[model samples]
Structure formats: C-alpha cells, structure tokens
Target: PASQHFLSTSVQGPWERAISPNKVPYYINHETQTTCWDHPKMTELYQSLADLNNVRFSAYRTAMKLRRLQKALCLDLLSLSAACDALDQHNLKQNDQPMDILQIINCLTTIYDRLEQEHNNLVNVPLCVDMCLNWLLNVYDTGRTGRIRVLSFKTGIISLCKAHLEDKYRYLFKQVASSTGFCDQRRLGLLLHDSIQIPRQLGEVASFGGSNIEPSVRSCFQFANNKPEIEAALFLDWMRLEPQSMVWLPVLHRVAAAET
Candidate 1:
C-alpha cells in the first residue's frame, strides 16, 4: 500500500515508463535522455515509504523529517563558522593568511582562558596552551612548518568541542591512526602523552603513574591482547576506562554540561 502511494505521488512526475528495444520495461526521464531499468524516483522515496508503512504516507511527516535534519545540520555549520569568526577576531592582522606559532598560541590561550573562567580556573593556562599547540602542530602541520592554515585550525577546534565523548574520541583517534586504521605504540604513545597533560596540569597525574607513557602503552596493548598495532575500537575501549592521563576530557564534558 505504501509502495502504491509512493508510485502514485512520485513516479508520475518527470518520468515515464517505456519499453526498450529488447522488449524490457524501463524508466525514462521526461526532461532528459536518461533511461534506466529501475524507477528514477524510487531510491529517493524508499525510506519515506518504509517509514509510512504502518502510519500511511503523508507529505507532512516527510517534510517535517527533512526540515528537522536540515536544521540540525545548519546549527552545526553556524556554530563552527562562529568559532572561526571568534578565532579570526583574535588575530586581526593575520586575516586571510596562515597563522604562525605565536599567533596560534595566543589564540589557543584565549580559548583555554575562557574555558577556565567558565569552569572556575581549574586549568593551567600555560601548560594547556603548550599541549594544544603540540596537538595542532602534530595533527595539521606534521612537517613542523611553524604555520597552519585557518581551515586546519577550525577543524582542530571544532573536533574538540563539547559534544558526545565517543565522537570526539573517534575523531582524535582517526587523526593519530595510520591510513590502514591502526596505530603503533609510538603513535598511540604520542596521543596519550599529549592527552595526559590535561590531567597532569590539573594535579591528577600521580594517580596514573605520574606521566610515564610506557605503563599506559603496555596496559593498552595488554587490553588489545598484545596486538602489534591497535585500531580505533581498542583505543576507544582503553579510553572508556577513563585512564588517569586522559580523564580530564570526560570531566570537561561534564563541566560544560553543568554550565548549560
């Protein structure tokens, strides 16, 4: 019944059924020479038809779904653009050019300072800024060129925004992982080392072995059962334990939620 409604509403517009030379039925576009064995509009209507199977098809429901999806995407776009604008305002002289280390550090310090102000100044500003610089350079300017593009800076900050913890973790892992979706101990160690600074600066490192990376790496690989290289899933599993070095991230998420 839903398929019948879909055909009546969608297929009758801008398409017509036709017969090929081989005596097979096909679809042809009314405004173009395109022809295909399958209905041109069916793919677009498939999800709607399935959704309306029990409730009966309605244009209002489909329109509402599309509108909500569009609004969600627009919100994400607007927030990222706003963040970029704020960063730009911090570096007025470097508009439309890549940022060097000092400019980058200034902007990052501003951001972290704002966060600390909002959350009661728990963060060590200088140390946090230093690690953030290390992370951005490692991720976007691997060549250590002493400069990074605006787009790269935008992406790095947005990925670290207040959102789902798992999503942030995955984005971070993808940045550190190799093309084959795996990271060796050294690479993983780099991420862990950088991440640990947050808790270390917060005076919580003693509980997690006081900044020694080898113990973290060993436990991570042990969790992976001694795999030579670990994938995102394993890394995520390790992070789920809220390891001492990286525990500040989830705490930061909670701090953000408390504010709002």
Candidate 2:
C-alpha cells in the first residue's frame, strides 16, 4: 500500500491531564460531572435501563433523536445544581404521574443502580439514552391534543436551557416567529425526534448521485420589513447582543434588499 503524501504524520502538541476530562479547562480542579455534557453518569444509567427494558434504536435513528432534543432544548444537564432544581419545580404536565425533581432523581439513581448490577451485560448506550430521553419529552409535553403551540416561557408556553436570554431568545425563534414557531420548528422538532438521519452510506450515495435531500439547511429568518412586530430599532438592540453579528450579514442584507 502506498502512503498518502498529502496527509500529515506530525504528532500533536502535548497537554496536561484534567482532573475531570469532560469539562472546560478552568473546571479541571472542580468536581467532575458538574459541567460535563453527554453526562457519563446519565449515559450509563440510560444504557443500563435500556438493557433491562428492551429499548432499541438504530445508530442513524439515534442521531436524529439526539439532534431533535438538541434543537428543542439546547441545555444539557450539567449537574445536580440550581438548574436541575429549577427544572424540578415545573410540574406542568398531563397523561402521566407528576414528575417532581425528587422522583426524576430517584428514577435516574435507580437506573444507575441497575447499570451497576448489569455492568457485564451487552447494552447499547445510544439506545438506552434514547429510551431515557422519552422521560424528558414526556415532562415537557402539555398532554393536550391541540395543535402544538410554541412557548418561550416568556409567552403562554415556555422553556429550554441556560436562560442565556439570547440563545434562549433564538430558540424562541420558533416560539416567537408566530405561526412559523408552531407550524415549522416545533412540528419539525417532534417529527425529527421520532425520525432517523439518513444512514451515512445512503447520504454518500445520494450526495454522489446529486439528489436533493430532506431537511434542507436553508435560511429561515426574515426581518426589517417595518412589520411593527420586529422593527429595526427593536432588532438592532437584540442583534448587537449576539456574539456573532458578522454571520447575520446575509440575513440583514436579505431584509434590506426586500425593503428596497
């Protein structure tokens, strides 16, 4: 076999060990799992529960589910801190028993125990996590049969991570975009949650064959039309706060082009 000259063989620069490998560098001295995403403990608990409960999903499907969760709720449970406590306080639900914080914690802790018990079993972690995700989805659901309404927690319906205000606000895009929030993003989120990403092999085939794909990543936002709902004066204040204003140039240009 010939070696590819184009590929570099250089070894990467070295780094110090982190006390908790899954965190920001500053958190190295802090307790592990406090700020880690894709929480290893939760992952293990879910994986074990799935093994015991017969939960199942293919890899491509699992990725789609993960993306669905990511799109709807950007916050990953970083720890057993105030964020979790806040989540526990919200008992807004239906068609299921009340999901208080203590019960939620107990469920997970039970799952953790089960995983410890079946440590030697052959269980797929992704499938397990998929099963556990259902718990949150159920928690977040209103248990009503009406058309899905978008909620920003500021409006009639609400929630998602960080309360980072801006990121919180962008997601409110679906919630705040009026009909688009309900008819588009929330609907899309639910559908995607239950769907699968096309297998990579299939994606490659379609890519090489030049076929249009589902889930097009086209631009969706449109503002600056003097619509009164999203006036330039109102938008500019929010826009300035966004960390990456340069990335928004095309969106602004489109609005500007539309006005002229």
Candidate 3:
C-alpha cells in the first residue's frame, strides 16, 4: 500500500518539477523573472523519476496526514462557538447583543463539554490529579514513578493543564457561580482561559516532531506516512539522478569586469 503512495491531489499538484535553466537569472521571485530556463530539459529530467521519488514517498503523503487529523476536532468547537455567537447575536437582540464573552457562555459551555469529553477518552483528569496529590503527599510514591525526575518537560504544558483543572474547581469554597458545579465544567470559560496555552505548548511539541526528520528527509518521510507510498524501483532513481546535477561556478564576465 505504501509503495503505491502517490499524492496526486490534482493534476496541478506540486509533485511536478520545473525544467532547470542553463543560467537562472537572479530574480527576487518568479513573478518578475522574465528570464527563462531550459524547460524541456528540466521537464524531461523531472519526469524520469516522477514515478519513483515524486509519487512514492512524497512529502505531501507523509507529513500532511498527521497534521490534518490532529486539529480536526478542535476546529469544530471553535466553529460551533462562533456560530452560536452569530445566531444569538442576530436572533435574540432584535438587532444583536453586544459582543461580550460573558454573553457567549452558553454556546462555549456546550462546546467545552463536548471537547473535554473527547479529550477525557484519551486522559482521565481526576485519576491524574489524585496521582499528583498522592505523590506530593507521599515521598515513597517514587517506586511507581521510577526514572522520571522532578524537573522534566512536565513543567510546561502538562503542569499548565493540571493547574487549569485544579482552578476550575477552586471556587468550591465560595458562593461564586463557577463553584456551583462541584467539579462541574458548567461555567468554565470565566475562570479558565488556559486551553489556549496548551495548544501553544503542543505547537512546540509539533515543531519538535517535525525536527525529528531532517529537512532533506522530511519531504520523503512525509509522503510515505501521510500523503502516499512509493515503490522500491522508483526510490533508487533519485539516488542515481540527483548526483548528475550541476555545480556552482561564477560567470567569466563577473570576474573579468571586476578585475578591470
């Protein structure tokens, strides 16, 4: 299945490479560059390995899939919240209610409940909180937590997430509207603005993931895993062809004119 990996989203996709010029003019961008390259030669060379390197183990195949799935759910939550705001603003207010967050809670609350329910399928907060509290309470908990140290990367996103859950129930002692739910996420947006922080931190995680693949190899691996698969026969074509490419040589005119 992977060997058949071809990322032809359209006939116009980026898989096609341009012809190499004998001397590509120094232009800031292609838009203003009136100078032309050897299009036929480049196109011919490009097609020679298109089936192998470009189609199989393509960058679009590997990288785009993971990224596309990762953010799919959250987009719905944001969209729903925005839709609620639009509907309520238009329908109830005669003209519309003023754009204030407090007025938008009912919609956001619904979005939060659904999002958290999905998130909890992956992680249980109450159990995690209990584990943390027990660890802080008992030094002997380390037997269960063996090589992990106190000052790990846990200091950033993980800690912030734990803190958000803690403070969500913090108003329990007061008659505050937020405290009424008893670990209820009923009025969360007012007290908790930390969800934004977790994604920002996870973005750092994504960057770290992307960096695991070297820039040269990212395009190759990205296509294999995410976009489409390439066959063995095609892959070796790149090995042979890439070495035949050009070298950097200064023009005779630049050096001659400068010497004079």
* RMSD, candidate 2, Å: 20.1
Model 3 TM: 0.16
> Which is better, 2 or 3, measured by lDDT?
2
For residues 1-260, could you state the per-residue lDDT of candidate 1 as single tens digits? 11222123224567765543422234667787687544453334333444533432222323233233222212212233344555767853332267776667677666656655655545555545544554465455545466766545654565445447787677567656787999998878766765554334323466556778788888888889898998988888888887655555565555445541
Give the lowest summed-lDDT range of ten residues in model 2.
Answer: 3-12
TM-score rank order: 1, 2, 3
Residue pairs in clash, model 1? none
Error of 1 at 217 (Å): 1.0
- Model 2, C-alpha of 78: deviation from truth (Å): 9.7
Best by TM-score: 1
| Candidate of highest lDDT | 1
Task: Please provide TM-scores, in order, for all candidate models, with all chains considered together.
Answer: 0.44, 0.20, 0.16
lDDT of 3 by residue, 125-210 (tens): 32222222222212212233322222121111122221222221231112112222221222222112221222222232232233
Q: What lDDT would candidate 2 get against the real structure?
A: 0.29
Ranking by lDDT: 1, 2, 3
Q: Write down the TM-score for model 2.
A: 0.20
